[PDB]
Short mmCIF file of C-alpha atoms and ligand atoms in Angstrom, two decimals:
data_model
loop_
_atom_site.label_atom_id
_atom_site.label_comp_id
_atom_site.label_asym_id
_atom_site.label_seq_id
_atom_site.Cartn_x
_atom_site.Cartn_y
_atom_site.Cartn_z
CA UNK A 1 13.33 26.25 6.35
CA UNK A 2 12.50 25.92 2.54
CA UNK A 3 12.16 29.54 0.65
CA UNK A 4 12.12 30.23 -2.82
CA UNK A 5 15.66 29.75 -4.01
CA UNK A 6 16.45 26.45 -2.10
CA UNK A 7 13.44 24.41 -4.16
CA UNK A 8 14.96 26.03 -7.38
CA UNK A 9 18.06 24.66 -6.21
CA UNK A 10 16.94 21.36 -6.08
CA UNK A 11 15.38 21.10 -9.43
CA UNK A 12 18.61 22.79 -11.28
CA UNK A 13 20.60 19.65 -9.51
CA UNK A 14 17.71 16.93 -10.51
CA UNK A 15 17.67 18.48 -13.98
CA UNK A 16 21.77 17.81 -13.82
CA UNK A 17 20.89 13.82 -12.67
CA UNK A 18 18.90 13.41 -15.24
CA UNK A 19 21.38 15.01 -18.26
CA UNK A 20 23.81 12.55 -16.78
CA UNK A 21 21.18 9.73 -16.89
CA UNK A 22 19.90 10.77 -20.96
CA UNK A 23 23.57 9.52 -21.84
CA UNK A 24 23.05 6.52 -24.37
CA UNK A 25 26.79 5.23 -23.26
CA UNK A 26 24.70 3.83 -20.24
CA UNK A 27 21.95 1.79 -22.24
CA UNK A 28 19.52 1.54 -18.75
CA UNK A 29 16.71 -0.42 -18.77
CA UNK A 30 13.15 0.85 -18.50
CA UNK A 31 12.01 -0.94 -15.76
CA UNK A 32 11.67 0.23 -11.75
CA UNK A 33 13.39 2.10 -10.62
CA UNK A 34 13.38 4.26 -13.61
CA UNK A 35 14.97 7.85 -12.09
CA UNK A 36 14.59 9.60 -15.88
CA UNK A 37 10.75 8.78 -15.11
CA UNK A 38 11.28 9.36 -10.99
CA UNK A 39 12.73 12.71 -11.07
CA UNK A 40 10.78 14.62 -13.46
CA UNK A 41 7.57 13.08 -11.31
CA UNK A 42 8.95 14.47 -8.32
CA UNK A 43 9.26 17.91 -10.30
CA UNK A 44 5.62 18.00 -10.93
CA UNK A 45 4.38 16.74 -7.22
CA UNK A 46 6.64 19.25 -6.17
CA UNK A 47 5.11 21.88 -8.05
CA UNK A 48 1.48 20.98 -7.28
CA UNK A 49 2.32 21.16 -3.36
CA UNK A 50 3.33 24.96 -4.23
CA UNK A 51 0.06 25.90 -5.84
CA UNK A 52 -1.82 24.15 -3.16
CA UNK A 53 0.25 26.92 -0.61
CA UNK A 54 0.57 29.84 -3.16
CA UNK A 55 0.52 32.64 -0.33
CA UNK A 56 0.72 30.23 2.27
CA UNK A 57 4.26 30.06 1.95
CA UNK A 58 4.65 30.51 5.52
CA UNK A 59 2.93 27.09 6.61
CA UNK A 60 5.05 25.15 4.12
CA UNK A 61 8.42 26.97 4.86
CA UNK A 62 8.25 25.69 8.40
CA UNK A 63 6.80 22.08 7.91
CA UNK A 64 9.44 20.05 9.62
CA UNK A 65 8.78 17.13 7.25
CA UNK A 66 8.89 19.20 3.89
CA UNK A 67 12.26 20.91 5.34
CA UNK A 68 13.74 17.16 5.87
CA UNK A 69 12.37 15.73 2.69
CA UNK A 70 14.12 18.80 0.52
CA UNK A 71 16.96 18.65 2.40
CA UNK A 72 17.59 14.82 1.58
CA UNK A 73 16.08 15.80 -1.82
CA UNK A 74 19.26 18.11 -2.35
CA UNK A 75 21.57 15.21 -0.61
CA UNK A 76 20.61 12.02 -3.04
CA UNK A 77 20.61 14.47 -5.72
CA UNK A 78 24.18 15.77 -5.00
CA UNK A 79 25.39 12.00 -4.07
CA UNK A 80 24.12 11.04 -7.60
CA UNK A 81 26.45 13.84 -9.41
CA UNK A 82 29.29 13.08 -7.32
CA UNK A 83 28.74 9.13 -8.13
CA UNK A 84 28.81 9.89 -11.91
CA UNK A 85 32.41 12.39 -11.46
CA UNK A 86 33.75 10.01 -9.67
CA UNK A 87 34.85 7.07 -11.84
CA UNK A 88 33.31 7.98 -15.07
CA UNK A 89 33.88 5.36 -17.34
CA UNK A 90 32.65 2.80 -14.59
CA UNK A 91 28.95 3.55 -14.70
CA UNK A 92 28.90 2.31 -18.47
CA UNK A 93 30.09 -1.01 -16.37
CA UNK A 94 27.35 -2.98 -16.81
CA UNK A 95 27.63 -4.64 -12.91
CA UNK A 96 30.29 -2.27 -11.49
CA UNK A 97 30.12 -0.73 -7.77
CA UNK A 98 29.14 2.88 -8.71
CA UNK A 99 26.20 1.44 -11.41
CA UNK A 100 25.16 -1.19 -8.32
CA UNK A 101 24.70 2.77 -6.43
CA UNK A 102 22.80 4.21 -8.85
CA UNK A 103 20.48 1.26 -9.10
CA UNK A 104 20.31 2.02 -4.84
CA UNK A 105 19.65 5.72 -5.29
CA UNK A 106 16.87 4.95 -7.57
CA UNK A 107 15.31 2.66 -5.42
CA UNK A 108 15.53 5.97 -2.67
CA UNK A 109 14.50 8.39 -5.29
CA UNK A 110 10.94 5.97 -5.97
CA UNK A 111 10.52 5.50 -2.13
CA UNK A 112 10.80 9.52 -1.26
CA UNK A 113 8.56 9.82 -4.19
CA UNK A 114 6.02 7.11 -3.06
CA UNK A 115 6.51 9.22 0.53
CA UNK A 116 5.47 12.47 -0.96
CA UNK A 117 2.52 11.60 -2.12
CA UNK A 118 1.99 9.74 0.67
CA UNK A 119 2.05 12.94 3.02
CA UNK A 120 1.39 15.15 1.02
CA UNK A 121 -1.35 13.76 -1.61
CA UNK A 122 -2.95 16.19 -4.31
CA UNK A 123 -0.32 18.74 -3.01
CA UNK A 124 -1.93 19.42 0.46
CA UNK A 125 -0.64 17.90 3.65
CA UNK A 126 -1.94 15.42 5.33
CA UNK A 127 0.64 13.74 7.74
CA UNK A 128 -0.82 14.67 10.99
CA UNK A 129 -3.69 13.19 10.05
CA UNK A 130 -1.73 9.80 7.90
CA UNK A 131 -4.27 6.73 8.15
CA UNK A 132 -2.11 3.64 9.70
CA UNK A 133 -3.45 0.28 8.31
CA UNK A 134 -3.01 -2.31 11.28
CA UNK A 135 -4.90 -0.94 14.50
CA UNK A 136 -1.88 -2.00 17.04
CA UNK A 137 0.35 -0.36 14.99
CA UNK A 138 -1.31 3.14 14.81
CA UNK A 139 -2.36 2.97 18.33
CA UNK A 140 1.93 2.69 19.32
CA UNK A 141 2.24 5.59 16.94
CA UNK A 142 -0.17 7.91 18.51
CA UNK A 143 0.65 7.02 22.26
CA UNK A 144 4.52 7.63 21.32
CA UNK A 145 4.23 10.38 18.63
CA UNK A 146 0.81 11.41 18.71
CA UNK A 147 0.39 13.06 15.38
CA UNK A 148 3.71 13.47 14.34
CA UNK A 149 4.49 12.60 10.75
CA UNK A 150 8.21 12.07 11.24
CA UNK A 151 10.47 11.32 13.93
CA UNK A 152 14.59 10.63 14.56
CA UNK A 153 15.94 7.04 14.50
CA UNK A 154 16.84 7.68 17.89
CA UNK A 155 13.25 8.40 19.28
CA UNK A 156 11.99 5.64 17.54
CA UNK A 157 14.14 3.49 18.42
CA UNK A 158 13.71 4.30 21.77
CA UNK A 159 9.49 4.32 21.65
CA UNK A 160 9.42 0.63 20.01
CA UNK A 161 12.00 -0.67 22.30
CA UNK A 162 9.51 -0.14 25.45
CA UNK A 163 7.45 -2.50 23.56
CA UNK A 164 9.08 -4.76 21.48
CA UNK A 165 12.60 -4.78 22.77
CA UNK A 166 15.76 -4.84 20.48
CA UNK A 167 18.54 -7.13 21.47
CA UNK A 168 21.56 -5.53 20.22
CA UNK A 169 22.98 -2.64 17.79
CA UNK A 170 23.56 -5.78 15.36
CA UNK A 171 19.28 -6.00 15.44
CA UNK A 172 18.50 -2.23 15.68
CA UNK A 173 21.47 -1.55 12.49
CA UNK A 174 19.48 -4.28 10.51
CA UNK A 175 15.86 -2.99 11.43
CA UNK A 176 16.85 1.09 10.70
CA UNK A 177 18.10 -0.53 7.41
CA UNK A 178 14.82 -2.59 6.32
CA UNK A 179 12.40 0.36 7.94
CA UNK A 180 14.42 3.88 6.96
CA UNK A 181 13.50 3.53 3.16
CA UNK A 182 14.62 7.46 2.31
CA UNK A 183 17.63 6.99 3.90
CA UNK A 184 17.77 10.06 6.18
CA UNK A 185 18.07 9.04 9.75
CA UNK A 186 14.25 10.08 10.55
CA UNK A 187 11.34 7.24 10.11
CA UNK A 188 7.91 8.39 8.98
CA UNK A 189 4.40 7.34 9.67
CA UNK A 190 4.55 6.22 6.17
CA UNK A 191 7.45 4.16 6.46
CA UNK A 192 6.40 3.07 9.79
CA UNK A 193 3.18 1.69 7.52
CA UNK A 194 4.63 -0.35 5.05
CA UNK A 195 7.13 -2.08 7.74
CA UNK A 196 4.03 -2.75 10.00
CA UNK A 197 2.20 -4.00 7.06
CA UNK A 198 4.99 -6.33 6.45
CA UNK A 199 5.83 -7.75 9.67
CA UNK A 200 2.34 -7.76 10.60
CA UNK A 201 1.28 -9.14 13.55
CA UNK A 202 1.94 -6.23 15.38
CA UNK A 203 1.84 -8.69 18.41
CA UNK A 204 5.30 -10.58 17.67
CA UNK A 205 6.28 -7.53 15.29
CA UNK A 206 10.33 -8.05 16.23
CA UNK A 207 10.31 -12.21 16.09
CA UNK A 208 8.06 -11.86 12.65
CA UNK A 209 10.96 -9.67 10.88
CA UNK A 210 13.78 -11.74 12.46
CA UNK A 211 12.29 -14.92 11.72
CA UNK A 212 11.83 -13.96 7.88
CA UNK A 213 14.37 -10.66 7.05
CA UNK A 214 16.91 -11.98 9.24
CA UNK A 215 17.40 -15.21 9.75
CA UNK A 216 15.50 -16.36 6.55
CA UNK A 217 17.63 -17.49 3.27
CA UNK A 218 14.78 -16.77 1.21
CA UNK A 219 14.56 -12.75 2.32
CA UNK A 220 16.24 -11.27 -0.93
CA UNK A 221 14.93 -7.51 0.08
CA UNK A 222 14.36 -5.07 -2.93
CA UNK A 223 14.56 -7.00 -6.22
CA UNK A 224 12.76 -6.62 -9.86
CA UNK A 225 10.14 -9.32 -11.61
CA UNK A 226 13.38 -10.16 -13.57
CA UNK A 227 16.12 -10.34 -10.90
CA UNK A 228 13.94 -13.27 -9.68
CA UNK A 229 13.63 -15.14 -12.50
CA UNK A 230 17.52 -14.39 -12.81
CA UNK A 231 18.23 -16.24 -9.49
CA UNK A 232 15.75 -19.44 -9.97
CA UNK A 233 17.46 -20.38 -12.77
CA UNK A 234 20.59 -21.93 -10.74
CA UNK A 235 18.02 -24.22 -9.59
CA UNK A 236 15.51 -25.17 -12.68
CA UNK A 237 16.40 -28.56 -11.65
CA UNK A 238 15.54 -28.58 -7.58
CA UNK A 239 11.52 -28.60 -7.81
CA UNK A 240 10.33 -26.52 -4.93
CA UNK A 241 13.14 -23.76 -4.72
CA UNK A 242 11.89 -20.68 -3.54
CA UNK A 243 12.83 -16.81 -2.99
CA UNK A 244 10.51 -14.19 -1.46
CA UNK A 245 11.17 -10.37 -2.43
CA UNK A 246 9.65 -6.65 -2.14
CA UNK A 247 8.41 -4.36 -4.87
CA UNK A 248 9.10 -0.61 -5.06
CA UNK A 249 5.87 -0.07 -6.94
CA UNK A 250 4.22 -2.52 -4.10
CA UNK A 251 4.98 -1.02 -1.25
CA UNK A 252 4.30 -2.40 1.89
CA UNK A 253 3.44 -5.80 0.41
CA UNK A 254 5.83 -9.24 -0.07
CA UNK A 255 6.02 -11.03 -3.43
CA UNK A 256 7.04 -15.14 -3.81
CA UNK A 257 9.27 -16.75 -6.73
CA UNK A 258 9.26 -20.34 -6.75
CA UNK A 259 9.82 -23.24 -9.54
CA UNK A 260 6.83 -25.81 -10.76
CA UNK A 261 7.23 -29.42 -11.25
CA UNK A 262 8.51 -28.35 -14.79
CA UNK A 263 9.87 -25.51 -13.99
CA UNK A 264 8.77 -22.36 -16.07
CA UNK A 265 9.78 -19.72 -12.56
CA UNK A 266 6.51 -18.40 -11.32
CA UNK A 267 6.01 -15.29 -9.17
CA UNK A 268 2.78 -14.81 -6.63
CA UNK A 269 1.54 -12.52 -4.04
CA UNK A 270 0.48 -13.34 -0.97
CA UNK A 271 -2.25 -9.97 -0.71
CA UNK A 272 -2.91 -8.54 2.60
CA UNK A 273 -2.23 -11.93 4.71
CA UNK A 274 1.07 -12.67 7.04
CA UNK A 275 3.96 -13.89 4.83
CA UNK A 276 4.84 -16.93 7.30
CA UNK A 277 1.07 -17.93 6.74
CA UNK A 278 1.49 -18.01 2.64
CA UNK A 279 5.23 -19.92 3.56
CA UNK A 280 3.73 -22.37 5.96
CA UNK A 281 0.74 -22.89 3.32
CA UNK A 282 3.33 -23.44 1.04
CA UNK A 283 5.76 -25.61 2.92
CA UNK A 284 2.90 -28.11 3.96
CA UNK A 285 2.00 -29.02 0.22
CA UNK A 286 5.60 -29.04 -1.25
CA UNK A 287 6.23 -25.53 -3.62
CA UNK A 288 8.26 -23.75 -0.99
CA UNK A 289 10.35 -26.11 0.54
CA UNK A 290 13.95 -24.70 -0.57
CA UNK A 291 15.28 -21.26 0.44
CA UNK A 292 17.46 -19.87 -2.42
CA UNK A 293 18.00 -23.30 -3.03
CA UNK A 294 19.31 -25.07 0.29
CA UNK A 295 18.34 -27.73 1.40
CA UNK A 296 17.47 -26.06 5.39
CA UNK A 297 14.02 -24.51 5.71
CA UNK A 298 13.01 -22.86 8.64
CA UNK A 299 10.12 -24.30 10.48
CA UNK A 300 7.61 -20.86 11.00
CA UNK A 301 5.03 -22.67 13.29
CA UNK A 302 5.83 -20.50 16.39
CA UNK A 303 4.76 -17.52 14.55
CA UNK A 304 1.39 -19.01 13.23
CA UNK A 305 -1.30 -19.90 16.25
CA UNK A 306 -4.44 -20.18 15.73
CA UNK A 307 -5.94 -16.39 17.11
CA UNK A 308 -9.50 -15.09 17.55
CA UNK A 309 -11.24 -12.85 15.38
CA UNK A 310 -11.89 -9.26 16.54
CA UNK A 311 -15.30 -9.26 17.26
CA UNK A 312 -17.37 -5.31 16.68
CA UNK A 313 -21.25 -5.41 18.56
CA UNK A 314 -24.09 -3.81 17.05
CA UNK A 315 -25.38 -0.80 18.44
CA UNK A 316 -29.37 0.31 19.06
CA UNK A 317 -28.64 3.23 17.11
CA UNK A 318 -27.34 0.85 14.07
CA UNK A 319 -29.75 -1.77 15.22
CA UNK A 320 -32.73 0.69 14.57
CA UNK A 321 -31.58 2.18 11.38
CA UNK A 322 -31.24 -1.18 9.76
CA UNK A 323 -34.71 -2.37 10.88
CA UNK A 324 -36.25 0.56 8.83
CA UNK A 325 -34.01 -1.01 5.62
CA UNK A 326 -35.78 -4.58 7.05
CA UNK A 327 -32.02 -6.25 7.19
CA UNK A 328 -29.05 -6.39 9.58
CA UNK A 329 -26.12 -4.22 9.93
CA UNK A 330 -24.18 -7.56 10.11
CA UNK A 331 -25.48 -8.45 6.97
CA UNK A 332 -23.04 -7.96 3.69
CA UNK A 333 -24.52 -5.81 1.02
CA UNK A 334 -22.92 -6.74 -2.18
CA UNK A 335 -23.67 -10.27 -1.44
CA UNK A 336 -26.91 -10.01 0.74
CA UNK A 337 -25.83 -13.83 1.74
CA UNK A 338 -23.77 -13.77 4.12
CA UNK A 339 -22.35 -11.78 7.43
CA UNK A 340 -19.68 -9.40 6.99
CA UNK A 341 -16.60 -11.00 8.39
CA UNK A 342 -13.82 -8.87 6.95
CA UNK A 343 -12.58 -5.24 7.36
CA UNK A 344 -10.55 -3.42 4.85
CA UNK A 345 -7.93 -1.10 6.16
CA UNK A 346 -7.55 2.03 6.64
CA UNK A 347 -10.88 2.89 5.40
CA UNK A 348 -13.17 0.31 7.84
CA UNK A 349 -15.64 -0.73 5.00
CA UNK A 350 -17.06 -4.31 5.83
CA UNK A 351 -18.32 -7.50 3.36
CA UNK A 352 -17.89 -10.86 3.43
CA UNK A 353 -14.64 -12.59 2.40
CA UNK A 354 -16.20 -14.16 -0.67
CA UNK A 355 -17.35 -10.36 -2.09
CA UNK A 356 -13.52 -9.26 -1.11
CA UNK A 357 -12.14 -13.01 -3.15
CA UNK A 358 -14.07 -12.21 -5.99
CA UNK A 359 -13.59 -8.22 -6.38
CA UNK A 360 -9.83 -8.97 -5.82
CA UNK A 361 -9.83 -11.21 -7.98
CA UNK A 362 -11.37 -9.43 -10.81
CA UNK A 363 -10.79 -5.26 -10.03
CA UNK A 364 -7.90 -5.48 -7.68
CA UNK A 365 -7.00 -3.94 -4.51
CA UNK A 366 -9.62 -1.21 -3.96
CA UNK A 367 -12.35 -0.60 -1.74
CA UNK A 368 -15.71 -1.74 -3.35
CA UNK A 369 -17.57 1.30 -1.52
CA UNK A 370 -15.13 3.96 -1.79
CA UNK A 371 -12.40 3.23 -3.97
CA UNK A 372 -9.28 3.39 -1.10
CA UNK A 373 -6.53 0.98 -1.79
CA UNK A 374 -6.41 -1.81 -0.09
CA UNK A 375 -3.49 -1.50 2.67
CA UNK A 376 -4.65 -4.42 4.09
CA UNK A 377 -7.69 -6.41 5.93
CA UNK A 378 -8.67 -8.28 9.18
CA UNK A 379 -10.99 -11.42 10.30
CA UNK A 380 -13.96 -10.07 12.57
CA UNK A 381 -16.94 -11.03 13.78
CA UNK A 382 -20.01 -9.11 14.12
CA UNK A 383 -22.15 -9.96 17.33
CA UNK A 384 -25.99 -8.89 16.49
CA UNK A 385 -28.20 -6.49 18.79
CA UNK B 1 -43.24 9.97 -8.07
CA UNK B 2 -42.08 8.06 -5.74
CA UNK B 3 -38.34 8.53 -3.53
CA UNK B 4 -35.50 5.86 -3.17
CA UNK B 5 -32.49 5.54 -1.01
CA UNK B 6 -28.84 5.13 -2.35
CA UNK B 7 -26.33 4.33 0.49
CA UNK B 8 -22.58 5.23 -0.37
CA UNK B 9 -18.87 4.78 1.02
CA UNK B 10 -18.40 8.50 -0.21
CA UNK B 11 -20.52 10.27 1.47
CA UNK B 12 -24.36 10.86 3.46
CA UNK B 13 -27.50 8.99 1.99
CA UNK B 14 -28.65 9.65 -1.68
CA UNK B 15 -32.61 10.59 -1.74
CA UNK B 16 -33.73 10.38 -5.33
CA UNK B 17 -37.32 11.35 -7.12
CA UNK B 18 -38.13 8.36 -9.36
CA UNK B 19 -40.30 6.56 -11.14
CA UNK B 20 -40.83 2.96 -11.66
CA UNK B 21 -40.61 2.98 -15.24
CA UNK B 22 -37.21 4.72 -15.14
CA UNK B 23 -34.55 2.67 -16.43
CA UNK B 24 -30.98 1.86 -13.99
CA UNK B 25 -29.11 4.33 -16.42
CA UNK B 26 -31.62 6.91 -15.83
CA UNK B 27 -30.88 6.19 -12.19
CA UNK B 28 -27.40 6.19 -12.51
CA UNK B 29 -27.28 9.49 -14.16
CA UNK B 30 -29.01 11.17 -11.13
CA UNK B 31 -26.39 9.72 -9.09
CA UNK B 32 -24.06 11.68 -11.87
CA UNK B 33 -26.25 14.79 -11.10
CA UNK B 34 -25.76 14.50 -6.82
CA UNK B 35 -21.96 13.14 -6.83
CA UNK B 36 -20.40 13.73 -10.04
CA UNK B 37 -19.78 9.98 -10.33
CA UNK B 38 -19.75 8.38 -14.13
CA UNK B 39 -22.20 6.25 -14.60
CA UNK B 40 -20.28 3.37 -16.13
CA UNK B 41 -18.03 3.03 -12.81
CA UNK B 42 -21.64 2.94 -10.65
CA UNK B 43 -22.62 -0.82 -9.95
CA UNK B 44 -26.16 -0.49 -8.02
CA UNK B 45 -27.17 -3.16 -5.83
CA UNK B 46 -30.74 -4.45 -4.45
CA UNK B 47 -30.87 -6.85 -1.32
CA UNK B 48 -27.62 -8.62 -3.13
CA UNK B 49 -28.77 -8.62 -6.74
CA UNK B 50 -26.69 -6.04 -9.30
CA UNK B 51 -29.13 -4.26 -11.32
CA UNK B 52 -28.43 -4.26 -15.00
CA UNK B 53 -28.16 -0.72 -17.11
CA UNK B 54 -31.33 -2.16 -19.50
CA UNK B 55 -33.81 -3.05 -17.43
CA UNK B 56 -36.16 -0.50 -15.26
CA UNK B 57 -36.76 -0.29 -11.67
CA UNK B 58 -40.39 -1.93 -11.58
CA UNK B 59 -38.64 -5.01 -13.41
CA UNK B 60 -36.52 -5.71 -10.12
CA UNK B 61 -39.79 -4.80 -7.85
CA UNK B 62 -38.07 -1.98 -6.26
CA UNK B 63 -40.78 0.26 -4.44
CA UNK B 64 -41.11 3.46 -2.49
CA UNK B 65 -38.38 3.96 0.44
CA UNK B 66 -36.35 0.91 -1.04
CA UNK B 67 -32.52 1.16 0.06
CA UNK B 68 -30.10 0.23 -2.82
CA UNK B 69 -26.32 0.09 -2.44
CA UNK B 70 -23.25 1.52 -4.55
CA UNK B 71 -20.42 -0.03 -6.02
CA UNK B 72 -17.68 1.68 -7.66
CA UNK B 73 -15.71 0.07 -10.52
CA UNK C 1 1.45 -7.32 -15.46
CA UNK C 2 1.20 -10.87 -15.39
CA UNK C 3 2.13 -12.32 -12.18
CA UNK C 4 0.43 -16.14 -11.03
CA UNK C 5 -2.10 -16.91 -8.37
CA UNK C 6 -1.20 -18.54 -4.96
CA UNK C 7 -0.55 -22.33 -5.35
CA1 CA D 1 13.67 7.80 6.45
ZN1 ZN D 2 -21.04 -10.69 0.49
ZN1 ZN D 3 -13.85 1.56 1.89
#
């Protein structure tokens, strides 16, 4: 239950974190994750979920995820002043153990942040009603949870092992690691998201995430633009050496290091299509053909075959309505050239692939009709009336 | 004069009172005066073709009941 | 940010 005094609580500890963090002895680098930028931003979301439920204390009090997010809140907070009492002079260690935990905590601090405003966006919740991005994936969700915005290890575990099965503790221990991003024992919808955007196809969800975060030499996990650049250079000299990552600021999406026929390190990302299919691209015409430099590359074919389109049939009611514009629901409308044979997720807006290319390509991730990020898309087909 | 259709990703159908000498800012600013949006972040689009800020809507033949689409950003 | 497009 989260009253008055508990939140104040929380912010007299993060204000203590980041007193500790000001100290020039410790000469940290600006980059994410940044906690002296982290913390105060979670100070301010914070604050705007409070005027959003200024009498309707009540509601908030007994959210069960706001009670488990503060509660962790206090707990990485506390974990972060014990780290700096304990052995003192060792977090001006450049690449000591403590300063290696600090760089972990601020990883957790950006994810629970990322989370919040996730669940909770412009300070009103919105959990029960969280938008998953692949349809399989949402569809487990609500048959298992139903609305539910967060749910024990334990019950997940259970729920996704009636349809993808885990083999062993060994594989459910590695996926609670890669999935519970706050570090709490309880998986969200939203972390549920970005690990099912990830390891998307739902389908072969399990062999997917063993086949490239646990078996795969190249899986590096969390690391920075410059960490990456940092490992390539061992091998400037082995043309085709590769390393795929994930970005804290990217959630939910992979990112690829590789060296040129010259060298120079250069970092892509694959955007809203299956990692293995970017690798496999990749492998075929020689520029990822060594895993953090060994020689062994795993062969990915059994998770790429060729799979239909979903295919979405006109209605008469749509049918109708678009004969009074004189053109074709299946018809895109930014391009008026081709059929739409895309969808962007969450938000279900459809063009044509070439529209999507281009305004990728030149505004980013966004929805061209109603400005929703792009989580991610799907191939379909529209059958005519 | 005459009445034109806007359809939208953020929200129902936009019915606007025009004229075909107004101008696509003109336009756009009664789009500003139904959603809020700012003009500069509308991109209006006519069976495929973007419609530029200069030109009017008699230039791009667009007539009475004519359904135009909108782009943001 | 300047990342690189896919190769
Ligand atoms: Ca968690
Ligand atoms: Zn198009
Ligand atoms: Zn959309």
């Amino acid at each position: 239950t989260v009253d008055k005094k508990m939140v104040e609580k929380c912010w007299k500890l993060m204000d203590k974190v980041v007193r500790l963090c000001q100290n020039p002895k410790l000469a940290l680098k600006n980059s994410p994750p940044y906690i002296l930028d982290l913390l105060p931003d979670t100070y301010q979301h914070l604050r705007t979920i409070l005027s959003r439920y200024e009498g309707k204390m009540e509601t908030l009090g007994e959210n069960e995820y706001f009670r488990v997010f503060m509660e962790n809140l206090m707990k990485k907070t506390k974990q972060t002043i014990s780290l700096f009492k304990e052995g003192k002079e060792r977090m001006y260690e450049e690449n000591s153990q403590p300063r290696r935990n600090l760089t972990k905590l601020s990883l957790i601090f950006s994810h629970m942040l990322a989370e919040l405003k996730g669940i909770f966006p412009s300070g009103l919740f919105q959990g029960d009603t969280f938008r998953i991005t692949k349809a399989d994936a949402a569809e487990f969700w609500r048959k298992a949870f139903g609305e539910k915005t967060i749910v024990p290890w334990k019950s997940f575990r259970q729920a996704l092992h009636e349809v993808h099965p885990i083999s062993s503790g060994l594989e459910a221990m590695a996926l609670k690691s890669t999935i519970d991003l706050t570090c709490n024992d309880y998986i969200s919808v939203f972390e549920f998201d970005i690990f099912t955007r990830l390891f998307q196809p739902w389908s072969s969800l399990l062999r997917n995430w063993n086949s490239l975060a646990v078996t795969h030499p190249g899986y590096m996990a969390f690391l920075t633009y410059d960490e990456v650049k940092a490992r390539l250079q061992k091998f400037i000299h082995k043309p085709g050496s590769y390393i795929f990552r994930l970005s804290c600021t990217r959630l939910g999406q992979w990112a690829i290091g590789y060296v040129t026929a010259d060298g120079n390190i250069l970092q892509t990302i694959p955007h809203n299509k299956p990692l293995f299919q970017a690798l496999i691209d990749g492998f075929r015409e020689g520029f990822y053909l060594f895993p953090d430099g060994r020689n062994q590359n795993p062969d990915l074919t059994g998770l790429c075959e060729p799979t239909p389109q979903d295919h979405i049939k006109v209605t008469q009611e749509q049918f109708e309505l678009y004969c009074e514009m004189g053109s074709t629901f299946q018809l895109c409308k930014i391009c008026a050239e081709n059929d739409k044979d895309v969808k962007i997720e969450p938000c279900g807006h459809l063009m044509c692939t070439s529209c999507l290319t281009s305004w990728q390509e030149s505004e980013g991730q966004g929805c061209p009709f109603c400005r929703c990020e792009i989580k991610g898309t799907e191939p379909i087909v529209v059958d005519p009336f | 004069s005459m009445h034109i259709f806007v359809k939208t990703g953020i929200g129902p159908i936009i019915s606007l009172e025009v004229e075909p000498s107004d101008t696509i800012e003109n336009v756009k600013a009664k789009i500003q005066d139904k959603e809020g949006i700012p003009p500069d972040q509308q991109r209006l689009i006519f069976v495929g073709k973007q419609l530029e800020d200069g030109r009017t809507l008699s230039d791009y033949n667009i007539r009475k009941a004519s359904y135009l689409y909108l782009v943001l950003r | 940010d300047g990342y690189t497009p896919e190769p």
